[PDB]
């Protein structure tokens with residue numbers, strides 16, 4: 001059995017969420033989760049929107065919840081760090097400035113163009129081109145940045161854009177995905193299974209292919225998260241992901257304390 005957890009979600013501390021931290025905790029307890037990790041956004045110099053994070057307030061609030069719910073659920077304090085290698089030193093100073101339990105590395109913008117609905121990123125660009133550019137940016141991060149635990153949402157690019165079918169297929173991106181997966185395994189990083197798009201069977205297929213090939217290429221650590229920006233969760237999607245993880249041959253999920261793997 002896998003530990004019942006959620007290792008990716010956002011509350012009002014993140015610039016694009018307004019949820020109560022307490023409501024995440026009570027929803028988690030109601031479902032019977034054993035452990036959760038808040039992963040609020042920090043992205044440096046983000047285009048169009050400030051993803052800043054008030055660390056004193058964030059730690060204070062979660063620390064109070066840790067004490068209050070100590071006997072009901074384990075609560076960790078983490079970070080979703082948007083990565084851009086141009087800002088590597090500043091990003092590292094930020095990560096090193098507070099005792100985060102867990103850090104997700106994510107790609108949200110490339111060359112100051114946000115990867116999102118309605119941006120220049122998808123303008124006059126085929127889906128195949130957008131996917132390749134997105135995955136090349138992910139590979140660049142994995143090859144040149146080390147200060148994180150898990151690599152976030154590899155299917156992020158498939159959430160957005162003007163295409164009739166936004167899905168991402170493993171086979172169409174096989175070479176770059178193998179390189180990313182092997183690099184993650186080689187550096188003992190976790191692969192995140194992100195359930196945002198798990199309502200779509202093509203998302204399930206994509207993550208199944210990621211999982212099986214990650215195992216083939218030496219991967220060991222898997223994290224699991226909803227990426228929910230509200231307390232309400234799609235538990236069916238979480239259950240679908242847990243099934244895929246077990247079927248791929250992983251029998252444990254990775255959890256972290258002070259950025260070290262719990263053993």
Ligand SMILES: N[C@H](CO)Cc1c[nH]c[nH+]1
Pocket residue numbers: 016049108114116
């Ligand atoms: N990572 C966020 C995507 O959900 C970036 C964003 C939020 N709102 C506008 N842009």
Ligand SMILES: N[C@H](CO)Cc1c[nH]c[nH+]1
Pocket residue numbers: 001002003004031032
């Ligand atoms: N045996 C399952 C995992 O421990 C029980 C469960 C799933 N979701 C909530 N509770």
Ligand SMILES: [Cl-]
Pocket residue numbers: 004005238239
């Ligand atoms: Cl669950």
Ligand SMILES: [Cl-]
Pocket residue numbers: 043044045046051052
């Ligand atoms: Cl900033």
Ligand SMILES: [Cl-]
Pocket residue numbers: 092144145146147
């Ligand atoms: Cl680094």
Ligand SMILES: [Cl-]
Pocket residue numbers: 227228229230
């Ligand atoms: Cl949400």
Ligand SMILES: [Cl-]
Pocket residue numbers: 226227228232233234235
């Ligand atoms: Cl959800």
Ligand SMILES: [Cl-]
Pocket residue numbers: 001002003251252253254
């Ligand atoms: Cl486990």
Ligand code: NA
Pocket residue numbers: 011012013014015016017018
């Ligand atoms: Na907010």
Ligand SMILES: [Zn+2]
Pocket residue numbers: 010014016041229
């Ligand atoms: Zn967000």
Ligand SMILES: [Zn+2]
Pocket residue numbers: 080106108152153
């Ligand atoms: Zn993200």
Ligand SMILES: [Zn+2]
Pocket residue numbers: 008009010080227
């Ligand atoms: Zn997120």
Ligand SMILES: [Zn+2]
Pocket residue numbers: 004031235238239
């Ligand atoms: Zn469940």
